[PDB]
Design a protein around this ligand. Structure first.
Ligand SMILES: O=C(CSc1nnn[nH]1)c1c[nH]c2ncc(Br)cc12
Length: 167
């Protein structure tokens, strides 16, 4: 028994709720929150900017030190950094950005990173401003992640579409 509340159960291990990921993290303080990162860990917009803003830019400061030491992530890759005031840890995961021409087949590789963590609060990867179809991202999530994932979908209209079209 964990502390996530109000989620709709999609499968054995995948749950979904119409929620702002920042407001969710602040309320639950999960072990792992997933960031929709880019390879440079430049948190300007979407999940990344909202989480980063909620950390008063501490996420960006930590991220810039990480990149200066390690160089960029791979598309499909991840790193574990601090969760600051939002979570114990933040798993920064790079899904492909369709709006930049990256291979959508890398979305499965991106979701595989979730399997290294027993429980995660996470957004749908590669959707929103990354330009891929959210219905597809949810399907890949369900078909790839085996650990317990709590998906926060910001847009109420999209949430209803995702639930109603879920197979
Ligand atoms: O932008 C995205 C990804 S795309 C999407 N996911 N659900 N609807 N659209 C966000 C996901 N969670 C968020 N929380 C706060 C803010 Br600000 C933005 C998002």
């Amino acid at each position: 028994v964990n502390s996530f509340s109000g989620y709709l159960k999609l499968t054995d291990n995948v749950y979904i709720k119409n929620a702002d990921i920042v407001e969710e993290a602040k309320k639950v303080k999960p072990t792992v929150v997933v960031n929709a990162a880019n390879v440079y860990l430049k948190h300007g917009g979407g999940v990344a900017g909202a989480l980063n803003k909620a950390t008063n830019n501490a996420m960006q400061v930590e991220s810039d030190d990480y990149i200066a030491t390690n160089g960029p992530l791979k598309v499909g890759g991840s790193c574990v950094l601090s969760g600051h005031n939002l979570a114990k840890h933040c798993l920064h995961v790079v899904g492909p950005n369709v709006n930049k021409g990256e291979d959508i087949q890398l979305l499965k590789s991106a979701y595989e990173n979730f399997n290294q963590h027993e429980v995660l609060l996470a957004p749908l990867l590669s959707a929103g401003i990354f330009g891929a179809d959210p219905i597809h991202s949810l399907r890949v999530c369900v078909d790839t992640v085996r650990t317990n994932v709590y998906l926060a979908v910001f847009d109420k209209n999209l949430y209803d579409k995702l639930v109603s079209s879920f197979l």
